[PDB]
Subunit: 213 residues, 4 copies
């Protein structure tokens, strides 16, 4: 619908230490904007940069142009799931999955998050990340499902960037029309948070396009 709700729970671990986060939000799928409030329920205070989780906290929240097949809006009411590997340039790897279903007007997420091999003096365990930069994801079809890759980066305290290579697989639960090669522009931002990030208000803006011209 023009205005949808979000309900979510994430369970996971970072370098073996487990935690849990729940969230509630709302957004406009046809405008490509969304926002949510996240609450840490287990494993607080989190000893890692919150930023590594933010892109796991839904490509249905992306404004798709008419000449571009929309894989995500097609997959409802049944929904879809996605898998992702997030490979940071210092060897830290985060694996995340999301099972997305629809109940009335509210999307429901079942998220699992697992990070390993973050060095203790790195920007993630030391919390020296500022935010994610805007990015452009590339989407193409492979083995009857939709892939999404993007080489992005996090800005660091005092300048410089921390790169991360995203590899996402999107699987609609039911068979939908497959799209051509296209792009999605992203901008995710933490707009407010408390000292230990037990409460986080997170926003994303996403728009699909087909590149130049």
């Amino acid at each position: 619908k023009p205005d949808m709700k979000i309900k979510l729970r994430m369970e996971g671990a970072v370098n073996g230490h487990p935690f849990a986060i729940e969230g509630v939000g709302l957004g406009k799928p046809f405008e490509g904007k969304q926002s949510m409030d996240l609450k840490v329920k287990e494993g607080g205070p989190l000893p890692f940069a919150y930023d590594i989780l933010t892109t796991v906290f839904n490509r249905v929240f992306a404004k798709y142009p008419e000449n571009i097949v929309d894989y995500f809006k097609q997959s409802f009411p049944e929904g879809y799931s996605w898998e992702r590997s997030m490979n940071y340039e210092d060897g830290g790897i985060c694996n995340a999955t999301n099972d997305i279903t629809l109940d009335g007007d509210c999307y429901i997420y079942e998220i699992r998050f697992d990070g390993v091999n973050f060095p203790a003096n790195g920007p993630v365990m030391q919390k020296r990340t500022v935010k994610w930069e805007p990015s452009t994801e590339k989407l193409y079809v492979r083995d009857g499902v939709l892939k999404g890759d993007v080489n992005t980066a996090l800005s660091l305290e005092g300048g410089g960037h921390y790169r991360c290579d995203f590899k996402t697989t999107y699987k609609a639960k039911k068979v939908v029309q497959l799209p051509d090669y296209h792009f999605v522009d992203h901008h995710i931002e933490i707009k407010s948070h408390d000292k230990d990030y037990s409460n986080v208000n997170l926003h994303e803006h996403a728009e699909a396009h087909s590149g130049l011209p």
Copy 2:
């Protein structure tokens, strides 16, 4: 504190391509000879829809024969124990993250294991169970930032011939400060010795020895 005849008790909770499962095991082995064996049972999520082989190297470098001219990081870490973290990067994009918290209760090592695999193509040898076994391997172990790292590029043999490659990145963290070793190697040979039709029961063996390369 470390005795020629130790026991293994383990539980793994995890998921592959989003589908969860759980496996328990009971084992035994000889740390000073570098040999071990266990019986594993699927307790949740069976029958497993992926090749069992991707899990076996998660199911303890204390079971490796270390010569005396090589500092033994793992046997030093007991009785307090150690933990390890690992990424396993398959050449077709399948990636498995696993963690193991290892403690010691009397004569039995106890594992708390987490396993999470993503992005395995449905047409690949992991989801279609076309792996035969792990080949023998030689791991590279070195120190970085006060902890021990171990990297190895190995492979799985496939049923119509050929090999399916995997890059290992392990971080070993002793629970308290031990002597750190110099650059060395561990030779591995892990084998499934018997199993069920669906791999609900698996008998797993490993043989390991540390060395220093040529000569």
Copy 3:
């Protein structure tokens, strides 16, 4: 130093899976429009046994339209010029490293290019010539240790459908000190417009435009 119309002169020497070749080209473009076109000729090692597409992005981010609010690293570097390094990483392990030394003579840029590709499998799309073209792309550019870096993972479309991925890592080096830009993007669309049977003659075009991501940028006045 930068004129609305510029010329291009280049020579590329290199090898793929150990077999050497050489290519010369002449071109023209408009740096402030971010467009260029050239004519390329194989001079050595023909006919080439690999897909020509792996060479095209080696054949000048000075040919990229920069908005007025984004610092332009490349147009600043002339008349002295700049150099760049890059090593493409294709998903089946075939890897190409490339270098370009770019200088200026009057109104003509001059390239000295080296291209070296290794480990292309015989049954892969490069050695079997099953690539159609490069898809449009969006490059990510950021600063590291006083020089400009460029990352983008893009793809080639394949003859029977589907895509063949490649990871780009470029380093750009101005020869003299210039102003460094913030993290930004460059959109690309490179196209082979015409070629003969064995790709002896190739007409190649590129369109490149810089932006700042987010909400793409005319407001009634």
Copy 4:
């Protein structure tokens, strides 16, 4: 075709971060004992501004001791010889691509080598010459598409301690049809034994043995 004492003659042309150089070498070794040594001389581009260590493993798996139960792909390929392709992926993004055409003239192997490295950061151990030596390694060899592959993640020890990692991917191509081996390993130990101040003269050694993993192989009679 293979005699217990063979000689080596080589020339390498290449560049690192765009700056070209050339090195010639003369050597000797015992293929059946897996040992070799050579003396290398910089002929162009000296003094080299990068750590010499990145070139040493490019300066022939015929010099590897094979047990009788493991098929020898390399000693089989002569007198025709073989060629190999290789990418070396360092953990900070430095990438070196190398090719070698190995031929045989009498009792002397002849190498034609190309070496091309890009994106080595200026503050890294290669451009600062902070490497000490390659650690010994164990390469893993397997067959793919009828040719021989070699993978090994290895490392260089660094001046102030610690290690600098590199990912090797080699493709070996015999010039004639030979019998293909099963999955096996080769243990390596390459050493610079002497060099002059700026590495214009370098004496280089390698020791190599193939095996089949543990249990490492008289049985007391």
